[model samples]
Target: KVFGRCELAAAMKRHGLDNYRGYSLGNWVCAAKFESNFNTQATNRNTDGSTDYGILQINSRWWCNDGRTPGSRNLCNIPCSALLSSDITASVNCAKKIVSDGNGMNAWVAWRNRCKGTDVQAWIRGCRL
Candidate 1:
């Protein structure tokens, strides 16, 4: 599922991330836009024998187990494949933990570089959601 901009905004807020850990809904939406372009099935293979999956691109090395990522940790305690489903509940739940674990939303390098310190209000508007 490729979420529209405001659709992602509504979904993210429903997951209670509107301001969770002091990050705005725009920040979450902005990061997701840059991270995976709101595509639920998105996956990116890493040079370090790992893969990042789903809308948030949860990595196999630390958050999920794809079985091929060498030395994977499975900190989110779920299969990496689950993150690619249309039901974003699993992926968002996993994303929440990444923040709670230690680094907040900064766990996504893409977020820091793209969404951080940027006025993302424009990205989050234009839809009723």
Candidate 2:
């Protein structure tokens, strides 16, 4: 089921984010599609053999030792996989924190603009800005 407006609005509030519309959620869904196929269970390995794990393909290495788990409690301290296991709200909220804590909504806006496939993608892909 698609995320409902009321629920999404509440989720936005959880992170102190606002000004999102239905279209914004659609845009987010698109990014999730390409990045992790919207599946929280998705995983991938990087070219260097580092692993991208879970829904957002968040790298476990970011929060784990080479072969040992850092523990969910400990690992949740890292926003990457924490966002993945936590679902759509957590993923986006985590992304927001990565881009800039409390400024994550801006990152989401940037993605929306970039996905337009016009001049925005240039900036997005070129410098990863």
Candidate 3:
């Protein structure tokens, strides 16, 4: 599923992403925009063969187990494929785990480069929470 901006906001909000761990819902939306453009099937391959999965692009190296990543800790204890589901519940669930592990939103370089220290509200402007 390719989520429109408002649709993404509603999904994230209902999933309890609004102000999650001090990060605004727009912040998460911004990261998702940069990460996958809200494409649930998005996938990017790392040089190490550890792939990033889903709109949030959770990685296989630490967060998920994808067979391609050697010695994965699988910290999220989920198959990498789970992140690509259009349901998004697993992706958001894994994202919170990433945030809780002291990384916060900085785990995603895309978020740091494009979303952090900026007014992310524009990303969700006029979108009802």
Candidate 4:
């Protein structure tokens, strides 16, 4: 399901994602906007035959298993389909682990290519946070 930006922000706050792993809430919002437009079911196929899953667009190569994708590490031990839901807890938790793994938001290409160095404060505008 595609969430409204404000709804996503509220959910992130409820899930304790605001400034999670030392990254700002705006950082997360910006990444989410570019990666999936807040759609939980969003997926993208990479040229490497791997898939990105969920709102944060976590890669099947390292996070979840897509069954058909070979060499998937499944570090999150989760089914990729599980990420395609309104509930974002698992996705958030997995992302937290990804950030803790040393790359920070750089683990996500959208973050690195788009959100990085941009003033993303507008992502949470009017959210009353």
Top model number, TM-score: 3
Model 3: how far residue 113 lies from native, Å: 0.5
Off by over 4 Å in 4: none
Q: Give the per-residue lDDT digits (tens) of candidate 1, residues 67-111.
A: 897767998899999999988899988988898887888899999
Predicted structure 3, TM vs. truth: 0.97
Give candidate 1's error at residue 8 in angstroms: 1.0
Assess candidate 2 and give its lDDT.
0.43
Error of 1 at 9 (Å): 0.8
Q: Per-model C-alpha lDDT, please?
A: 0.88, 0.43, 0.93, 0.89
TM-score of each model, in listed order: 0.94, 0.45, 0.97, 0.95
Q: Give candidate 3 misplaced runs (Cα > 4 Å).
A: none
- Model 2, TM vs. native: 0.45
Report backbone clashes per prediction: 0, 1, 0, 0
Number of the top-ranking candidate, with lDDT as the measure: 3
Between which residue pairs do clashes occur in model 1?
none
- Superposed Cα RMSD, model 1: 1.1
lDDT for position 95 in model 4: 88
Off by over 4 Å in 1: none
lDDT of 4 at 60: 88
Candidate 1's error at 43, in angstroms?
Answer: 0.5
Full ranking by lDDT? 3, 4, 1, 2
Candidate 1 lDDT for residue 64 = 91
Q: What is the lDDT of residue 14 in candidate 1?
A: 85
